[PDB]
Amino acid sequence: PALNIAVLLGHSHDVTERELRNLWGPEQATGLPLDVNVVALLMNRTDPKSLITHVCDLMSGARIHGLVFGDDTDQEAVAQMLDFISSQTFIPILGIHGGASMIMADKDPTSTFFQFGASIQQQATVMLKIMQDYDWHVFSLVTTIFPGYRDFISFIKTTVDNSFVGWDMQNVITLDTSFEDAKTQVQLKKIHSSVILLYCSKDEAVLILSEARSLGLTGYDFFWIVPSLVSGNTELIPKEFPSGLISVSYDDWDYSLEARVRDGLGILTTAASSMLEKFSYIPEAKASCYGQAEKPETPLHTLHQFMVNVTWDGKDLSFTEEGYQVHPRLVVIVLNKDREWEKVGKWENQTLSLRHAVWPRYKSFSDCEPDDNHLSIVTLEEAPFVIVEDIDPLTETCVRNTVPCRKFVKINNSTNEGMNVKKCCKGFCIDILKKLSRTVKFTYDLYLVTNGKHGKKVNNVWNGMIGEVVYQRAVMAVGSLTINEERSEVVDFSVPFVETGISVMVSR
Amino acid sequence: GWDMQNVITLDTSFEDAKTQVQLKKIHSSVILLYCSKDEAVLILSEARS
Amino acid sequence: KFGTQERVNNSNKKEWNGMMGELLSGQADMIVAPLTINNERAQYIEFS
Amino acid sequence: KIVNIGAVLSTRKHEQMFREAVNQANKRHGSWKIQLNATSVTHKPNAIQMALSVCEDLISSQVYAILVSHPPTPNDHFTPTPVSYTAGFYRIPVLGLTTRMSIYSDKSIHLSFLRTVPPYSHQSSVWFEMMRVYNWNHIILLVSDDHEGRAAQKRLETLLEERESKAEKVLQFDPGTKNVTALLMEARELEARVIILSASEDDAATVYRAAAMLNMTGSGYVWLVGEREISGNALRYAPDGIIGLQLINGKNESAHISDAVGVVAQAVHELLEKENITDPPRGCVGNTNIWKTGPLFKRVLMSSKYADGVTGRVEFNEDGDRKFANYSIMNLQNRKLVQVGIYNGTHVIPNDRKIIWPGGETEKPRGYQMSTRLKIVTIHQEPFVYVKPTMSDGTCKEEFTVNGDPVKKV
Amino acid sequence: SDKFIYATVKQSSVDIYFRRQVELSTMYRHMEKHNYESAAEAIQAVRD
Ligand SMILES: *[C@@H]1O[C@H](CO)[C@@H](O[C@@H]2O[C@H](CO)[C@@H](O)[C@H](O)[C@H]2NC(C)=O)[C@H](O)[C@H]1NC(C)=O
Ligand SMILES: *[C@@H]1O[C@H](CO)[C@@H](O[C@@H]2O[C@H](CO)[C@@H](O)[C@H](O)[C@H]2NC(C)=O)[C@H](O)[C@H]1NC(C)=O
Ligand SMILES: *[C@@H]1O[C@H](CO)[C@@H](O[C@@H]2O[C@H](CO)[C@@H](O)[C@H](O)[C@H]2NC(C)=O)[C@H](O)[C@H]1NC(C)=O
Ligand SMILES: *[C@@H]1O[C@H](CO)[C@@H](O[C@@H]2O[C@H](CO)[C@@H](O)[C@H](O)[C@H]2NC(C)=O)[C@H](O)[C@H]1NC(C)=O
Ligand SMILES: *[C@@H]1O[C@H](CO)[C@@H](O[C@@H]2O[C@H](CO)[C@@H](O)[C@H](O)[C@H]2NC(C)=O)[C@H](O)[C@H]1NC(C)=O
Ligand SMILES: *[C@@H]1O[C@H](CO)[C@@H](O[C@@H]2O[C@H](CO)[C@@H](O)[C@H](O)[C@H]2NC(C)=O)[C@H](O)[C@H]1NC(C)=O
Ligand SMILES: *[C@@H]1O[C@H](CO)[C@@H](O[C@@H]2O[C@H](CO)[C@@H](O)[C@H](O)[C@H]2NC(C)=O)[C@H](O)[C@H]1NC(C)=O
Ligand SMILES: *[C@@H]1O[C@H](CO)[C@@H](O[C@@H]2O[C@H](CO)[C@@H](O)[C@H](O)[C@H]2NC(C)=O)[C@H](O)[C@H]1NC(C)=O
Ligand SMILES: *[C@@H]1O[C@H](CO)[C@@H](O)[C@H](O)[C@H]1NC(C)=O
Ligand SMILES: *[C@@H]1O[C@H](CO)[C@@H](O)[C@H](O)[C@H]1NC(C)=O
Ligand SMILES: *[C@@H]1O[C@H](CO)[C@@H](O)[C@H](O)[C@H]1NC(C)=O
Ligand SMILES: *[C@@H]1O[C@H](CO)[C@@H](O)[C@H](O)[C@H]1NC(C)=O
Ligand SMILES: *[C@@H]1O[C@H](CO)[C@@H](O)[C@H](O)[C@H]1NC(C)=O
């Protein structure tokens, strides 16, 4: 049995037809019971008439049992068109890049059309994971009348209702219109220092963020989380977008179009192999789009139910009933001080890995007030005073009477680098630090020290707490730090809170 | 035994980015205001909003 | 089991078990048992 | 100066009357500044044929808005879907004449789709108004698993949120299922006696047959359904006393055509007074760029209120759907349907007709029947609840306390 | 300590109360592995 797959691309990409055909030449028995004859095609642009004619020609002539579509522009409508074609042709159509990669809400029940993208629910889940990892439990929700907001709000409410984390949701704001006129400033002014989940369009986000800045809602302690709708094209960035704007999107940097086409062809091949193993033979495609065939056109067996269980060589590219990828390749990016989108974290296998364990402070604008109440504090593990413990397996976050603290742990002594693991620090000194925060009204980023041990001057260079404080890497050293003549000379000390001398321990 | 939370000075305009976070910093139930009537109207309107 | 809000490993959904699971799912309408009252249990059901 | 308007109509006489309405609107507004030229095309059995014809005839004619209606054939399986996609490519607004499917209500799929009739999802609002009239608090939902059932359930839940109340249960069944007995068995043990059903005609007929064979049509039960449940085969098996809804001019074509052409003419006249107005693209082939002022035309249509519409005051909400339509609450009596009142945009007003509730009784049934069979759950605690195995007779031996009083056992 | 083991019924009110308490967490991690399925089993275990 020979399986014909048509791969449609545009002239914007540099991939040629010969390269597309050579893509399916690995020669390791990719299809055990069948062989794949990939046919490629290139088109100028995307428009209804030419796209439909090309698809009909491919179905009638090449007798394709599937279709892989790669779009270059950002026209979302094409995606819907593709779905319609499926509903009229029963040929599985895969969205790869561009407009075809834009996810739609509800597909036709009889349409076997799937996309390489992430749904709004997955984006909201990734946002919640980002907020939980950084312990930004308190947050607000700002939405507009843009389509796809009711289901987003419902999913957010369902997630906040069914999560063991506190998730102190302040309120939900729905700005219908007249953002700068009236009836909207009163709602936007009642949000305090927290995290804002903004859902709108890019041009609408322009005005929303401009008014938020005009209302002083873009400070250092305000973190804005937005979906891929307002991120849009990575190349162009509005000037009024504040730095530190965390967004989630389908990655376009590491995941090249060649890998996209290879994964699509592999998905089609493994679905065909599974169907051949289960059913008898691949059904022939429809004769032609036109002619008004007198039939139900319903095949006895289709590939719709065989794409739920898909496993390619290394990755799990399974799909859901609605057509969303079970494990989409989602990337969390930020707008750095250079006014460019920089990749930060990734989300695969329901595991979120961030490059920065602690969120760095980002200057929202050139005229923003300088950071003064946010402090970096070093702390060392001491059994009576500072107890360091792993993340709670149940809540997946720091438990009560504990504070987050990142420890720089290496893979081993062999490597000259390590990662910051966010553990939970408690004890006497941690409680004292919490009380000081509650009194003086300052925020802290407590992190363990890995250079020295309680401080010692070697080669006229201090390490440990004294070294960290003197070299401007921290503002204070809360812990079991003993007051000493040289230490007091080098750095200033506070009033002692406990009498700690030197003593001798002996066995009874 | 008074509880003086803070002192806020509205040196700049009453509708810019400033004088909003400063106003938001108020958590007490009693506010002692001191200005002239013309900007008093604006400050009270902003507080009401 | 008396009843405790426990996280199911799949899909990460809160679920009540025991008398709580029986009552909240509609399988039971009233619990006459040595059920201790506390803050967590009063959030979802009502105690006399 | 000339402004073209495209139409995809069922019959030739419909096209002729649409052209006459275009001429009437041009005469009313005045053709001295702009002349409204109307182009029309008849439906075709194949959706791909529609997708080709809309580009070959309507798009190539540089139309500003397309009026789409259902074909004369009783089939109603998403017929206007192709057009709404093609004109959605260029953000060309599409006015829906008699398309009540709510899948088009989601603007995320159909970028530019307006309609002069409310979808089946909005019918839930009517039921909510009944909630305020007959004082019903506990209800049972029988929505389907397709998009219509989900949308109706979501809208009803959203409307009940403001009352701080929720439906007792939301039963869901797959479309086109021969057997539904399990859902009715599950619903029987519940206390709520208000059943709300919204599905296809075949599913509604199956549910009605099951309820008739399951003693669900007796006294104390009230059924609230939409239009689809009281039209066609679903009417044959509908239990007596069922309350259904029908829009006044849902199946009417001429009135909707006239009102739609009037509102689109008013919107075009209002829009052309603005500056840098951009003409629509000509032809699908060779032009992949969207219409520059297409979204502006969409907002103009959505913000336009017709003065004297035949079907009523034409007004579109934020979802691009018809608002404030006349609903006729219409009840089945003696295997015949009679109007028992009329529902306006916000409130329900009855008439001199007497409502006959299911079971034949005329008194308004209570929302629920109090269940006196409490399902009791108990845990094995030795000091409180001793548990003992029984003998072969079904009961365990009776004992007595120190005072001689017998111990009560269940 | 290892020599002194104290436990309670798994998934009950006392488990919730001990889990929520801020100073009582240290013993909770010890007791969570020793919880019994019902009161009768715990009574039998403490008896012998
Ligand atoms: C998805 O496909 C995989 C691979 O074909 C299935 O895994 C095999 O399932 C069969 C039948 O249960 C077992 O006999 C094999 O031992 C499995 N292989 C491995 C490597 O685990 C899997 O069961 C399929 N899942 C579904 C839901 O269809
Ligand atoms: C995909 O995710 C699952 C769930 O996290 C991973 O399964 C876990 O694998 C680790 C590593 O061996 C175990 O410690 C966990 O106990 C597993 N959990 C479950 C629920 O099975 C799985 O390894 C991941 N697959 C990858 C990363 O390829
Ligand atoms: C004005 O409307 C008339 C009526 O539809 C248009 O005439 C049609 O034009 C199309 C496209 O060329 C032809 O396929 C039809 O056969 C024409 N109809 C008749 C009866 O001849 C006319 O083109 C429109 N003019 C403008 C400027 O849009
Ligand atoms: C639909 O399924 C239900 C449940 O399987 C069927 O109900 C059974 O009906 C028979 C008599 O008709 C009883 O003896 C069984 O006890 C019922 N089942 C249960 C679980 O109570 C029902 O008959 C089915 N419908 C049709 C048309 O066959
Ligand atoms: C539905 O209700 C009818 C009437 O209330 C029931 O018919 C009676 O059922 C009883 C008990 O089975 C019989 O003793 C009578 O002879 C029946 N009368 C007639 C006229 O049929 C019927 O059984 C009920 N059905 C269900 C499924 O509850
Ligand atoms: C659709 O509604 C219109 C408007 O009510 C109906 O047209 C009316 O028909 C009657 C009887 O022929 C006339 O007296 C009115 O003057 C007409 N009104 C208008 C505005 O034309 C039309 O008959 C209805 N169509 C159907 C199929 O019921
Ligand atoms: C049915 O719809 C018509 C719309 O044609 C309603 O008639 C309007 O009623 C209002 C309220 O009295 C008047 O101000 C208008 O002048 C009437 N005509 C129009 C063209 O709007 C009629 O009231 C509706 N039926 C109801 C609500 O029972
Ligand atoms: C729908 O009908 C109701 C009932 O007649 C209308 O409500 C009345 O409106 C009049 C006119 O303003 C008031 O004087 C009455 O007090 C209202 N009564 C109630 C109970 O609300 C309602 O205005 C109608 N809506 C429309 C759009 O016509
Ligand atoms: C579009 O592609 C065709 C080939 O099918 C080509 O002849 C034509 O020149 C292309 N259009 C443009 C604008 O390049
Ligand atoms: C760790 O590595 C350093 C060099 O990087 C080495 O000097 C030291 O002895 C190592 N410690 C061990 C192997 O315990
Ligand atoms: C890993 O660490 C251990 C303990 O420090 C050490 O003995 C071992 O040599 C390390 N592995 C290397 C250096 O490859
Ligand atoms: C995961 O949950 C399922 C469903 O409750 C249960 O059967 C299974 O034992 C659980 N496994 C673990 C490791 O908790
Ligand atoms: C086009 O007209 C609109 C409406 O007045 C205006 O906002 C816009 O700036 C104009 N654009 C140009 C390029 O003149």
Side-chain angles (χ1 to χ4, degrees):
Chain A
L3 194 74
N4 310 66
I5 294 92
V7 187
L8 289 160
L9 270 300
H11 282 346
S12 300
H13 323 109
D14 50 355
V15 192
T16 66
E17 293 179 353
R18 178 73 221 191
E19 293 150 337
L20 287 176
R21 309 160 94 101
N22 287 3
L23 265 168
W24 204 252
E27 311 303 319
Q28 61 256 8
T30 59
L32 316 176
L34 75 164
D35 57 77
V36 171
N37 298 114
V38 164
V39 65
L41 192 47
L42 274 188
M43 51 195 208
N44 307 330
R45 301 292 298 161
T46 61
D47 60 357
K49 163 147 191 179
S50 88
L51 171 54
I52 286 181
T53 51
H54 279 133
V55 171
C56 290
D57 194 5
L58 285 175
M59 182 179 72
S60 69
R63 206 80 33 80
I64 62 170
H65 316 84
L67 183 69
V68 162
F69 190 92
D71 175 64
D72 45 359
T73 187
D74 55 342
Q75 197 58 227
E76 45 259 53
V78 183
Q80 287 81 17
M81 271 291 324
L82 272 185
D83 183 75
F84 162 69
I85 293 181
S86 163
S87 72
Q88 287 313 310
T89 45
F90 310 95
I91 48 174
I93 297 169
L94 274 168
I96 288 301
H97 183 248
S101 66
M102 301 265 178
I103 192 63
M104 76 156 49
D106 279 28
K107 286 155 194 134
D108 189 285
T110 61
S111 65
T112 66
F113 170 69
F114 299 85
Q115 286 176 349
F116 271 52
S119 68
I120 186 55
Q121 278 80 16
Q122 280 143 351
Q123 280 156 342
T125 300
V126 172
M127 293 180 183
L128 265 292
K129 213 61 190 61
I130 295 295
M131 271 145 68
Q132 156 179 334
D133 188 75
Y134 285 143
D135 291 331
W136 295 336
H137 308 154
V138 63
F139 75 104
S140 298
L141 181 49
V142 171
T143 61
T144 65
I145 202 62
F146 193 78
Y149 82 104
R150 290 182 184 272
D151 43 358
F152 175 71
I153 291 184
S154 298
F155 180 75
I156 285 296
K157 283 189 175 181
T158 299
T159 307
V160 68
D161 189 359
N162 206 323
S163 278
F164 275 113
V165 184
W167 289 127
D168 186 74
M169 201 215 88
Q170 293 303 50
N171 55 5
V172 168
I173 296 95
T174 306
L175 309 166
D176 50 2
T177 185
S178 77
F179 299 159
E180 65 272 14
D181 293 331
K183 180 67 174 66
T184 66
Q185 311 275 30
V186 60
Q187 313 163 303
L188 275 181
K189 273 164 175 184
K190 74 212 176 187
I191 296 90
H192 283 257
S193 170
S194 49
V195 173
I196 302 300
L197 300 172
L198 168 68
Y199 182 87
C200 53
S201 48
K202 190 163 193 144
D203 294 331
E204 194 145 349
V206 166
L207 309 186
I208 292 295
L209 280 168
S210 174
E211 297 178 4
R213 180 188 189 184
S214 163
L215 293 187
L217 268 294
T218 66
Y220 289 165
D221 63 358
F222 287 93
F223 314 105
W224 287 74
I225 318 296
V226 286
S228 173
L229 290 179
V230 303
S231 73
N233 217 27
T234 298
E235 287 81 4
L236 61 83
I237 297 157
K239 55 184 293 292
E240 65 277 0
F241 273 10
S243 314
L245 173 71
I246 297 169
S247 168
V248 298
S249 71
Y250 199 48
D251 62 358
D252 303 341
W253 303 264
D254 203 10
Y255 200 59
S256 164
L257 182 80
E258 198 86 341
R260 292 167 183 266
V261 175
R262 184 153 191 151
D263 277 334
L265 289 175
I267 286 182
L268 281 182
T269 300
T270 187
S273 175
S274 290
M275 173 155 97
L276 286 174
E277 179 191 358
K278 177 161 320 192
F279 270 79
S280 50
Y281 186 32
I282 312 292
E284 189 175 0
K286 201 170 181 178
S288 289
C289 314
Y290 321 99
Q292 190 52 45
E294 281 78 8
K295 211 188 180 296
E297 293 93 7
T298 307
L300 311 184
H301 51 267
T302 184
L303 292 170
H304 180 73
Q305 81 266 18
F306 294 127
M307 263 163 181
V308 180
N309 199 44
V310 160
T311 310
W312 181 247
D313 58 359
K315 312 175 183 67
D316 185 15
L317 293 96
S318 162
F319 292 97
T320 52
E321 305 90 351
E322 307 94 2
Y324 316 137
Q325 298 224 359
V326 184
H327 312 83
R329 290 271 289 272
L330 273 174
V331 63
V332 177
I333 64 179
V334 70
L335 187 63
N336 52 16
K337 62 204 209 72
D338 303 346
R339 313 287 307 175
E340 59 180 22
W341 289 115
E342 158 192 17
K343 152 174 182 176
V344 166
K346 62 170 47 71
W347 164 268
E348 301 96 300
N349 170 264
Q350 289 85 18
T351 61
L352 171 65
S353 80
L354 295 88
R355 198 170 75 200
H356 304 325
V358 61
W359 184 242
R361 319 283 279 182
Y362 281 107
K363 202 152 181 279
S364 88
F365 286 102
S366 309
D367 58 346
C368 199
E369 61 86 20
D371 195 359
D372 304 312
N373 282 17
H374 202 80
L375 302 183
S376 184
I377 305 188
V378 296
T379 294
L380 195 144
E381 170 155 47
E382 182 65 26
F385 301 111
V386 174
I387 297 169
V388 178
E389 190 273 330
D390 189 358
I391 306 100
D392 193 12
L394 192 149
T395 77
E396 280 310 308
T397 196
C398 280
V399 295
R400 74 277 188 192
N401 73 45
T402 63
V403 302
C405 49
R406 45 157 190 106
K407 176 173 174 57
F408 190 91
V409 56
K410 304 175 182 180
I411 304 94
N412 197 2
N413 187 29
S414 61
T415 187
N416 298 350
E417 50 90 17
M419 51 175 198
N420 299 291
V421 160
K422 174 178 148 280
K423 293 182 183 293
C424 304
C425 292
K426 60 171 187 170
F428 190 90
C429 286
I430 295 315
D431 190 292
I432 297 300
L433 192 145
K434 283 200 301 171
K435 286 274 201 63
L436 294 174
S437 69
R438 179 182 317 293
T439 295
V440 191
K441 299 289 94 175
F442 72 98
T443 65
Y444 47 83
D445 303 357
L446 189 153
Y447 80 97
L448 262 54
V449 64
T450 60
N451 183 22
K453 185 68 65 68
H454 282 100
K456 165 179 266 181
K457 186 158 58 78
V458 295
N459 296 115
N460 293 114
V461 162
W462 282 99
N463 57 8
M465 301 326 198
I466 301 299
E468 291 291 326
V469 167
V470 73
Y471 292 135
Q472 310 282 3
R473 275 194 292 280
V475 74
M476 64 184 73
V478 176
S480 49
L481 183 63
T482 314
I483 298 153
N484 189 359
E485 152 79 14
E486 41 188 9
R487 298 190 201 165
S488 181
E489 159 192 350
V490 168
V491 298
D492 195 334
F493 280 161
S494 73
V495 174
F497 46 88
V498 57
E499 311 94 1
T500 70
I502 65 170
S503 169
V504 176
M505 182 36 49
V506 293
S507 64
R508 172 178 302 277
Chain B
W2 288 119
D3 173 339
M4 211 205 88
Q5 282 195 351
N6 44 2
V7 162
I8 304 161
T9 302
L10 274 70
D11 63 358
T12 182
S13 177
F14 313 103
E15 321 87 340
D16 69 324
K18 207 60 56 184
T19 62
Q20 286 279 354
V21 54
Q22 306 261 40
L23 267 179
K24 272 190 210 158
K25 267 152 54 186
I26 292 163
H27 273 304
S28 46
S29 173
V30 186
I31 298 85
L32 265 176
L33 184 147
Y34 177 82
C35 67
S36 66
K37 207 164 198 165
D38 290 331
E39 73 269 17
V41 161
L42 311 182
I43 291 170
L44 272 297
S45 82
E46 298 287 14
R48 159 177 160 86
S49 164
Chain C
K1 306 308 165 297
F2 270 81
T4 289
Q5 208 161 18
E6 186 47 46
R7 172 177 287 173
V8 59
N9 51 42
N10 47 74
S11 74
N12 185 6
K13 299 289 94 176
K14 270 171 231 172
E15 186 178 0
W16 287 98
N17 48 3
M19 284 74 74
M20 302 306 218
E22 294 293 328
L23 169 70
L24 272 184
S25 66
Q27 304 185 51
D29 290 18
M30 164 164 53
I31 304 170
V32 298
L35 194 53
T36 309
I37 49 184
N38 54 5
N39 184 37
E40 293 83 3
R41 292 172 175 171
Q43 293 180 14
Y44 304 93
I45 62 170
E46 186 176 2
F47 295 96
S48 81
Chain D
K1 155 169 88 146
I2 186 178
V3 167
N4 295 345
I5 280 174
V8 180
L9 274 296
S10 60
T11 47
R12 271 281 297 107
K13 65 103 175 179
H14 280 140
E15 295 185 14
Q16 172 59 36
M17 185 179 288
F18 152 71
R19 271 199 299 278
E20 294 167 5
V22 165
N23 286 7
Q24 290 184 3
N26 209 359
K27 286 187 204 303
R28 209 279 295 283
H29 292 285
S31 68
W32 68 270
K33 192 161 53 59
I34 47 173
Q35 163 159 346
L36 279 169
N37 195 30
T39 182
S40 63
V41 62
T42 309
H43 289 284
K44 279 170 199 46
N46 213 345
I48 306 288
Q49 282 290 326
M50 209 46 49
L52 264 74
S53 179
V54 60
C55 293
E56 289 171 350
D57 304 341
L58 268 53
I59 301 299
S60 65
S61 288
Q62 202 170 31
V63 294
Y64 283 65
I66 297 169
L67 307 158
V68 61
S69 72
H70 287 284
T73 307
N75 70 322
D76 301 320
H77 50 80
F78 303 98
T79 313
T81 300
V83 170
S84 160
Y85 281 159
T86 294
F89 204 107
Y90 312 100
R91 271 70 171 173
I92 293 183
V94 179
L95 292 170
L97 294 182
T98 56
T99 301
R100 307 202 65 207
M101 212 56 68
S102 196
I103 185 61
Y104 309 93
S105 177
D106 204 340
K107 287 301 146 284
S108 165
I109 294 92
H110 308 265
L111 308 162
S112 73
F113 191 85
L114 277 296
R115 42 168 153 194
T116 78
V117 297
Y120 293 140
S121 178
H122 275 79
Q123 281 176 148
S124 68
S125 287
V126 176
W127 301 326
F128 187 56
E129 279 303 321
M130 310 276 258
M131 295 298 102
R132 185 200 61 43
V133 164
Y134 301 90
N135 196 20
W136 288 323
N137 300 5
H138 295 112
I139 62 170
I140 303 300
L141 268 173
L142 276 297
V143 298
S144 288
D145 289 330
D146 47 10
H147 182 79
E148 289 302 8
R150 196 175 292 98
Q153 170 189 0
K154 280 160 41 71
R155 185 68 174 276
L156 196 46
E157 290 267 310
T158 292
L159 291 203
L160 270 294
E161 286 314 313
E162 70 95 18
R163 184 176 178 179
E164 281 305 8
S165 299
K166 54 173 279 290
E168 178 81 346
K169 295 295 293 296
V170 291
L171 315 180
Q172 287 172 322
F173 61 97
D174 314 302
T177 52
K178 304 315 172 186
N179 201 349
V180 76
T181 315
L183 286 184
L184 291 178
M185 281 315 78
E186 175 175 348
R188 181 156 73 175
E189 296 102 13
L190 299 158
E191 70 162 90
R193 302 312 179 94
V194 180
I195 295 181
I196 290 174
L197 174 65
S198 170
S200 66
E201 293 83 3
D202 304 333
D203 305 359
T206 286
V207 161
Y208 292 158
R209 218 151 58 251
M213 311 275 98
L214 287 197
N215 279 341
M216 295 298 102
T217 76
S219 300
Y221 283 91
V222 62
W223 293 72
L224 306 178
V225 293
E227 179 182 9
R228 275 183 309 166
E229 301 56 40
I230 58 176
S231 49
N233 308 347
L235 182 53
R236 276 164 33 82
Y237 306 143
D240 295 358
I242 190 167
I243 288 174
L245 318 175
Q246 290 182 356
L247 196 148
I248 296 299
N249 303 305
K251 274 74 68 178
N252 190 302
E253 298 293 330
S254 295
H256 282 314
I257 279 180
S258 292
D259 295 322
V261 72
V263 66
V264 76
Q266 160 171 357
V268 161
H269 274 78
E270 189 169 337
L271 182 63
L272 292 175
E273 302 294 354
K274 315 308 294 303
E275 63 183 1
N276 63 49
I277 301 299
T278 304
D279 52 353
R282 294 193 69 261
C284 285
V285 58
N287 201 345
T288 182
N289 218 51
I290 63 170
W291 197 14
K292 277 318 151 174
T293 182
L296 183 63
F297 194 23
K298 181 179 180 294
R299 282 82 58 85
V300 164
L301 275 164
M302 264 187 44
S303 49
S304 78
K305 302 172 299 313
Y306 201 74
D308 55 355
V310 167
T311 187
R313 172 150 202 73
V314 170
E315 203 165 352
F316 307 122
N317 61 346
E318 79 273 51
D319 269 328
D321 286 351
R322 173 73 172 277
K323 204 169 39 177
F324 310 135
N326 296 15
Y327 285 79
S328 86
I329 292 170
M330 152 165 178
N331 186 359
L332 184 68
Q333 294 173 21
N334 189 359
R335 293 298 183 187
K336 202 167 54 56
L337 289 155
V338 291
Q339 167 163 347
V340 297
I342 190 167
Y343 166 73
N344 72 5
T346 317
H347 281 81
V348 190
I349 59 170
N351 265 21
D352 55 353
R353 307 290 302 207
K354 315 295 296 175
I355 300 193
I356 293 193
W357 308 97
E361 72 167 80
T362 179
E363 195 272 332
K364 165 192 90 71
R366 188 177 178 180
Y368 54 72
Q369 289 184 355
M370 201 55 267
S371 74
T372 66
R373 286 197 51 82
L374 278 297
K375 291 193 285 184
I376 301 295
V377 63
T378 315
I379 193 66
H380 167 40
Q381 271 304 288
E382 195 72 20
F384 281 89
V385 194
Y386 301 94
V387 285
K388 300 294 187 181
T390 186
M391 283 73 74
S392 296
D393 56 351
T395 177
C396 63
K397 45 162 297 187
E398 57 183 1
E399 293 89 1
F400 308 94
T401 177
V402 63
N403 296 115
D405 291 79
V407 288
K408 276 159 296 302
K409 311 175 133 191
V410 188
Chain E
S1 66
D2 186 74
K3 62 96 175 179
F4 192 79
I5 171 172
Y6 49 93
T8 194
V9 176
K10 195 187 299 178
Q11 294 178 356
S12 73
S13 66
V14 58
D15 182 79
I16 289 298
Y17 164 68
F18 274 10
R19 198 171 68 187
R20 184 151 50 71
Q21 285 299 105
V22 298
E23 313 89 333
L24 278 296
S25 180
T26 177
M27 71 205 48
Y28 177 76
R29 294 177 290 108
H30 163 97
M31 83 193 321
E32 60 92 20
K33 67 191 62 176
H34 307 125
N35 290 139
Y36 285 152
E37 71 86 10
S38 69
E41 317 285 346
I43 293 162
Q44 190 61 37
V46 68
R47 193 161 192 179
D48 44 29

